[PDB]
Chain A
């Protein structure tokens, strides 16, 4: 069974940086699409960044120029480098494989004060 395990979340002050990691086991990691989603307490879970087979990346508009998604086939890990953090980025951040009806981590919490 596929497992997605996030880590790296925590509390930072505005302007700070955080790097999230997600270990993925049981997937054809080099080929499937990987993504980061997030969910604030009142809102639905929404896409943040997506990276497809050739490490082609895409970003939500509110996040362009601040966040960077990347992947490491050798470690089968996907990363979200979050810089210039805004309080509006406070949410539970979820790792995802094979699209929105695919597979999900259990999230890592991020708080920006």
Chain B
């Protein structure tokens, strides 16, 4: 899947200044682009606009060369796998949440394999009816990290053309979490991936790194080229 922002400006409802200004961003099919910058710089806004929680003020977002606003909502949800705290949950079983409410389109074994590959099966097993426990209402509320791993499992299961990855819980070390990064690394390979970077070390391998400051893209390049550029990214290379 191809994703392109053309002269995109966006302002959160009620705000008086834009969150994004004249964003031009091309992510060709199969490439990974890492967005870096301070929290509140607009990097998360860029990724989240693809989900159409809001519409842009001006400009164009194109998906496979078609404006986002031309897709039916069903087609939009099918194209994009969101791995973030805003992954959409259903008042339904865990298995049905991993399957994105698509029933009898996946097998039980596929759902279970996706759960294990996301390292979600450990906490799922502690629920009374396992994968078939009803989450949400009159049921279990997911912790934040549990919700992320449900999102990883859903993304692993669906094999979607577009991945939006918010690398939350940058504090990572142990075994089940080290292999989470390994699972994410394989998922973003062979897929158009927009990654919200929260630790710089995790995105040195992106095909292009994009530095956002105050809603403006200030620098673009590979990790090595950006270091030789001795600009903003090179200065941010002080957190290591």
Interface residues of A, Cβ cutoff 8 Å to B: 28, 31-33, 35, 46-47, 50, 52-53, 58-59, 98-102
Contacts and interface: CB of A to CB of B under 8 A. Distances in A.
Q: Is the interface of A mostly helix, strand, loop or mixed?
A: loop
Contacts of A52: 218, 231-232, 235
B24 to A, nearest CB: 9
Contact of A99 (B21, B213, B231): B231
Interface string B200-220: 000000001001011011111
A53 B220 contact: no
A32 B216 contact: yes
B161 interface: no
A33 B230 CA distance: 10
A58 B231 contact: yes
B11 interface: no
Interface of B: 21-22, 208, 211, 213-214, 216-222, 225-226, 228-235
Contacts of B221: 99-102
B229 A100 contact: yes
B36 to A, nearest CB: 12
Contacts of B214: 31
A47 B21 contact: no
A31 B213 contact: yes
A102 B231 contact: no
A44 to B, nearest CB: 11
A31, A58, A99 pick with most chain B CB within 10 angstroms: A99
Contacts of A46: 228
